[PDB]
Amino acid sequence: VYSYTEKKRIRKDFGKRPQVLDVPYLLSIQLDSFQKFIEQDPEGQYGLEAAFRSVFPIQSYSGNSELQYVSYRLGEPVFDVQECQIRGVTYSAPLRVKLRLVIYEREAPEGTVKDIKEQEVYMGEIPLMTDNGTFVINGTERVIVSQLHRSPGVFFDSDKGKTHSSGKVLYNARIIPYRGSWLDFEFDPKDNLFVRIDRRRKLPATIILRALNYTTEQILDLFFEKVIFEIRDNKLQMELVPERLRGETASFDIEANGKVYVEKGRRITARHIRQLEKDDVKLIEVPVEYIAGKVVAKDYIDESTGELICAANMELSLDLLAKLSQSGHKRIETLFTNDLDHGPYISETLRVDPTNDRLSALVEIYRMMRPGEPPTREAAESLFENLFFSEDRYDLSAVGRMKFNRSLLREEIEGSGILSKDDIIDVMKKLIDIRNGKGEVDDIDHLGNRRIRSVGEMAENQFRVGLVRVERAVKERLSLGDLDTLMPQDMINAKPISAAVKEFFGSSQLSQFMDQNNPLSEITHKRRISALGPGGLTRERAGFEVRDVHPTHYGRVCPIETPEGPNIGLINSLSVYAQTNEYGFLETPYRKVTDGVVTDEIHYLSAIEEGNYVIAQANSNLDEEGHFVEDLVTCRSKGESSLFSRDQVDYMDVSTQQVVSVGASLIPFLEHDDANRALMGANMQRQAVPTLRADKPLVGTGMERAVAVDSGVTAVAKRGGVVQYVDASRIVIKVNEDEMYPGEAGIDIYNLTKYTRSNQNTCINQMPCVSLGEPVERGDVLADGPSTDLGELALGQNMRVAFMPWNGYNFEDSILVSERVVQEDRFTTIHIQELACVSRDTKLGPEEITADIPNVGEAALSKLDESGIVYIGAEVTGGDILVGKVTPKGETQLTPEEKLLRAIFGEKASDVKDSSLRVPNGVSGTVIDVQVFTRDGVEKDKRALEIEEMQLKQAKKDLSEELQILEAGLFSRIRAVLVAGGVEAEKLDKLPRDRWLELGLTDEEKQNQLEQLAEQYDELKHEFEKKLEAKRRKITQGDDLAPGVLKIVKVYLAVKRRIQPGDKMAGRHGNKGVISKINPIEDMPYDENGTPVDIVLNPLGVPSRMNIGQILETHLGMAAKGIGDKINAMLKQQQEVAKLREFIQRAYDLGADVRQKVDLSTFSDEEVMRLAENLRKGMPIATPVFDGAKEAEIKELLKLGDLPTSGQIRLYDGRTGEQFERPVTVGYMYMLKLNHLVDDKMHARSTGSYSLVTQQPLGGKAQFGGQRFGEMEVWALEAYGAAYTLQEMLTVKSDDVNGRTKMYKNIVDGNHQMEPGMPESFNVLLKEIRSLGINIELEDE
Amino acid sequence: EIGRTTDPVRMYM
Amino acid sequence: LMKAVDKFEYRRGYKFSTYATWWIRQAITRSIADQARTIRIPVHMIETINKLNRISRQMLQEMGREPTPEELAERMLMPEDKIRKVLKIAKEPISMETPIGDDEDSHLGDFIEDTTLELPLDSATTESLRAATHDVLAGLTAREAKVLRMRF
Amino acid sequence: IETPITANFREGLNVLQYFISTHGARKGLADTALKTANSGYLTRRLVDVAQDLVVTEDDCGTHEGIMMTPVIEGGDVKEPLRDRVLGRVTAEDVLKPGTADILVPRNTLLHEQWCDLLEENSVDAVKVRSVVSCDTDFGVCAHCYGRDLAR
Amino acid sequence: VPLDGGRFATSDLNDLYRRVINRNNRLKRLLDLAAPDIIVRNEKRMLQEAVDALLDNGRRGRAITGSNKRPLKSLADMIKGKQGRFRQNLLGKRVDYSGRSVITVGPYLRLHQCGLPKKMALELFKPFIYGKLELRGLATTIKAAKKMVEREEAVVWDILDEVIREHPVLLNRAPTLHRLGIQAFEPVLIEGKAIQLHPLVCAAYNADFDGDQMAVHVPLTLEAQLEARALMMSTNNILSPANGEPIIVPS
Ligand SMILES: [Mg+2]
Ligand SMILES: [Zn+2]
């Protein structure tokens, strides 16, 4: 039940909760995004097909001319990934688009096409994503980070009394389209509705409604209810809907059928309401004074003179009703408005609104949009149409339409991309209802209102922008075009598409250099979510509501993996099980739970659907039946957690690791550490640099295998088989018979990547982990990449640490390291840097790479050959010359007394100037690679010829070896298929190889007996010849360099760096420290067996930081090292194998109801011995994040070992020999070396170069510059009495041109005195101020 | 309508 | 347009727009070629650059990808060096205040050093050489020192 | 939240309690990030307003002062009078607690010995000079300032 | 100035001046050619706008964009801002004779001394070494002294030990919250690349040993050396200026 690669070293698991869901692929997001970006979709859906179909067909200005799209194709890349990396070019593929131009007949709207023109055009280049989800832009590897932004739709805010002193809430609404202009609705303290467009000056909300071809009466009908008042005897007999007497204060008497239902001062209650409903009362008696505030609905005109008796939306009074009733009106309707439920804000807005009709509304909108311009009817109509009702300027794509419909409680999820009057009215009514009280506002921090935008979507948007920029030009050209004189190629330019794609992929905030110094760092970068970039937020413009974790983040976003500093909470990281919905939302797996049984069916729920149900907790007890042991289960319903019944549970958590990310899932005993320390340790875990040798983490979590396999730093076997050949740079696999195609030579060849430099100047190397003849299977690891051993992740080393103070050498956070650590080279790293020498052309003459450097001794160029290039493998130090170069120098100057010196010495001035490339000071190493690039038309030198010859020989050798490997496999298959059917007994083998296949003796039944082979041989030979020709052509061809340069020489140096005081080291629980000293072996504390300790740590940092995880991991590592020591001693005594089997079985069976089951009765003796030899250095232990081992289990393991149960032993001082009181905790725990190397930070300067505009020193460590003396330092010196120090700091050492040289001459002469002079910065400021109309000067008196 | 603008393009138009 | 109005003739029967368009476009193009670059380039060289760019674009569209400067000489009529010089002509200069990422809020102008300054080590060597030559010239006879000082 | 965390760091916290604690950790980190940015601006504004003040005289010859009393809020004293009087010069001559004899003179510097004597005698409230009442033009005198509380 | 590679770098003032000059020339030509009143007014308005944008861009109307995307920088922009001349180049300035590296503990040190790497001190006290070598007669010329220092003979170390015997230095941490952010110490030559700092001044410096760095400054003149010895010496300031309490207490 165990794979061959797993039987080598089995990690003990202490988990208890069974696993039901496997960990998905950690790099699926980028692959899926790119595969949705580019793929042949036979539909009008997402992609280039989409883009093309969005623009084409492009029709002319009604000239019976249109260029119509047909199909698109992608070409083969010119270079591969390695060649692109070497040449510093972009790994992309040509784009081929097949267009068609059709010209109709003259004076015929639907006439047959006069001509048809079909051609194929080339439209830019598209970069291709590598197999590891990365891109190559210019020789380097870049990773695009996914963006999180607000989802399109409509949202409602609350603004709980912040902009007003009275604390009144002002609700508002906002519509955010995917592409277009913004529409805003808001309230005011005077209960009026206002509308804003693109955050411009606010206008009354009725202006747009009037501009929507809507009259006052229609607006009142839409936004208000109608009550009809009659005119019978009494004339005061209005209908009475029963539900219209709720929530208001009574002011009069209501009577029906001669019954006084409610007396004066009495309130209509539910009893009165039900009494009226039972009585079916419709007509009631009302006093004449009740109609004082009523507002008429429509307008009434006289029949005699046609005069407007009363206009719409005006107060009705006694005189008005008398006037409209003496004219012969019998039916009057008003508006039913309350004071707490039906607010009359529409009437107030209409009263405020000064516009009259559609024309006035359009004029006002045009004036607001374009102030200072005289309005025109056509211009205003076009502007209004284009604002929100044009498909070219407004986009409401599927996600936005779906959000709009969901917020509006519609029934359809699809619609049009433009807005509508119905939609605007619905939003206004929803806002009115929210103001009234029914409904709730939305929160912008909800994960259901935030969408994820990916690289495929961004590339599609860029391509669409380029396509519309091109279609504008094609329309402009076709406006004055012709019919039979142009081809469908002149109107298409690939320049704007190429420029757009190049700028997007090279200069963007989401396009960043990949951090390739750790497989964990590489896998973390591709799973990063950022809220910055174009269309997002800004680091200084954000507040607090977006910088804090939300309850919706459970299972989707890791709460503890975010950088600390200016951008905290905006660079969050994706969790392990998080996925992306169809519309771009986040969702997490869940287990469906029926009435009593927790089933094994997995369901994916978004943030909106999660709140509807109630989800149980991962750590729930169940005994092989799906029923909960306890009658009550702790569950979370809606953002809160409380006790729930057994039968009320709807869903259960998949696993305990779904709440954290992959980086945070690799910290053992995480629940025992503080959150800040866990976050710091997660942030520091990806900064580790690979060491010379990495074995394994003694205490892990089990995700190391997944992290190593998912990253591309290792080599995985595509097909199972038996290893045929093993080498340090090649692995050959013979494929199994049942796992290979009917006819083909089945042999897998893997080429390992040797020493290469990464983006952080580290070392990348692959080493084989298999032997000769070892069976392999699918998914087995064949080669180990950096920071990986046996297909497991190993960031650092495990060390024997002790917790005690040692003479103040670990005072605050310092780490004391023994000499044996640096003696054994346990923390030694390899670094590789590249240096380039550029030979350009000058007006005085071209430069040379000759080796006759003037004024250079012979011993200073012994490492250079006759061509002036250093040898490969030469040891060089600081100041050593690598490549010699000279530049022309003509008649610079001759100062006096130099002519006299030359006359005395008879010396000639050098014609050339030394500009050779030399090793930087303070660094040493070895030359391992030299590359020479030369421009076309320039004769190559001896080194270039030798490099070309070596490259041709290597290419021919590789091609021939792979060809003969293929042929050997093919002939082995020939022999096998022959022997299987229709063979001679011992005669076909004696046939020569050229003709052995030339038999077909019995293809009678075995058609392919030789049939499937000769064709294979033929294609193999032909492809070998063609590839040889193409490769030699590519090698022999010239290079393409920038104008002005002739040759470029690149030198690679390998630097081996050892550990030293000042380096930074850290663990996995957020503890860090700088090495202070390196004590001898005899000075380190030792135990009763004489074994010294390696690391000494300060116990003073444990209680304040509150992280017991380090102590627990120390105890676990000590137990594992005791077990490993016992195993090693038993192996050294080599008594038998039964004892080893029994001990290993006991060790693997120790625990308490552990899910892992290991049985050694099915293991062979050879496998048992191999496992025992692999377990010599300690048995690995897997600690699940929230299901790890317990203190009781640790004590049980320690008791299984010979170590004391308390975990503390007795130590002796190596200096004095006397024992230490208060026994010291000693154990093993994992250590990491962060790349904060001291030799990369030390810098010093005395004199150097100065800036151009202001004569001041330059930056830091790049131009050999000095430190900056700031305002705080000036204030400190002013608080002190160091006036002279301040003066010499800000005049002589910085600005005074004569001051600095005078001080230098005085120091050389031995006089410590200075002249203050005048700073050049003040003169520059004076000149700058004088350049204005301001006169400033210094007077002398 | 003599003002309320800053860009000279509008005034030229 | 004013220049075209100064020379318009209505006896030909053609409308004024046809005659004015040529003058307007000529003036606009001349102004663009004259005062649209930091470094002035003559009209003939601007026309040569435009023709080279148009050819290159046409050949890229027709053939499939970017060509080589050597191959442009076959298409055009050039000694294969004028095209190289035109390509080697510097583009518009980079802004001094352009930023480079964050870089602690620093621009491109903070990394340019003056090369016209002399080192203090050089100044001290010069002073020492002057003192040494004065001391050596004091030892010689007065007439020899005078004639040397006069010659050099 | 009405439900507290009943597990300590020695035992194993669960996902719910860890997720709850993450909120406080992030709030603390944001507050720490913003406090430095606010304090820098405040310190700059405070430095730039009083950068021209320099002691220029030795004794301005004034008689004004500030009445110094212990801080009482309605309970236990949070600021003994020794702290607010040590290192200052007295504006007027101190009298005996019983108003019988002349105590320490006017223009003396109250060191630890004087403070111990005042404590022993149980003096209620001594008045001292201050820089706001200094008569020196364009600066302050040494006597009004008192003593530098660093030497 | 010509940039390395055959390219050039320019400031926005050149482009503003170019614009102004070109518009003035066009206005002169139009005045000479008796242009219509509307065209003359348009040219005058363009000239006013160009001068206004040269003097202060973005103040009167919309800012004029630069070469590609960003707006131009004006004289007022150079004068103002945190990156202006007053704050960035006149109140605080980069200085020579400075160095920085990582700090360590070195508990054996005394209160008035610190640890200094040999390479940092050799790089800092270059003129002093040159002068001492010239005075001792070991090096005939300053060039010979420089060659001997580059070769790192056995006598330059003795010269450095002689010159660093009683020459204080200045140590500063990048946040200078109070007066005690800069102090003076007496260098001790040590092997390595890390500075050792006395544990007692750690609380005053508000510094730790988890990757913190500090800067080094060398007083040049006699008066500066004497001021650093008499006022900024660590042993001379043990009491906090804020309150009269000790500040070098063990933690
Ligand atoms: Mg620190
Ligand atoms: Zn005073």
Numbering used by the authors:
A (entry chain I): 2 to 1342
B (entry chain L): 90 to 102
C (entry chain L): 412 to 563
D (entry chain J): 755 to 905
E (entry chain J): 253 to 503
Question: What text appears in the publication on this structure?
Answer:
To gain further insight into the mechanism of CedA, we used cryo-EM to solve the structure of CedA bound to the RNAPσ70-open-promoter complex. Purified RNAPσ70 holoenzyme was first incubated with 85-bp DNA representing −60 to +25 positions relative to the transcription start site of the ssrA promoter, which has the strongest association with CedA, as determined by ChIP–seq. Purified CedA was added to the preformed RNAPσ70·ssrAp and the resulting complex was repurified by gel filtration and used for single-particle cryo-EM analysis. A structure of the whole complex was determined at the overall resolution of 2.76 Å, which let us to build the CedA model de novo. We identified CedA adopting a ladle-like shape and binding the RNAP at the tip of a β-pincer formed by a lineage-specific sequence insertion βi4, β-lobe and σ70. Instead, it binds βi4 via predominantly hydrophobic contacts. An N-terminal part of CedA, which was reported as unstructured, stretches along the DNA-facing side of β-lobe and the very N terminus (residues 5–10), bridging the gap between the β-lobe and σ70 region 1.2, effectively locking the melted DNA in the RNAP main channel. The N terminus of CedA forms several hydrogen bonds with σ70. The only side-chain-specific contact was found between CedA Asn9 and σ70 Arg385, whereas other contacts involve main-chain atoms. A close spatial proximity of the CedA N terminus to σ70 regions 1.1 and 2, which are bound to a nontemplate DNA strand, explains why an apparent DNA binding site of CedA was identified as a −10 σ70 promoter consensus sequence.
Here, we identify CedA as an unconventional transcription factor specifically associated with the RNA polymerase (RNAP) σ70 holoenzyme. Structural and biochemical analysis of CedA bound to RNAP reveal that it bridges distant domains of β and σ70 subunits to stabilize an open-promoter complex. CedA does so without contacting DNA. Finally, we show that CedA modulates transcription of hundreds of bacterial genes, which explains its pleotropic effect on cell physiology and pathogenesis.
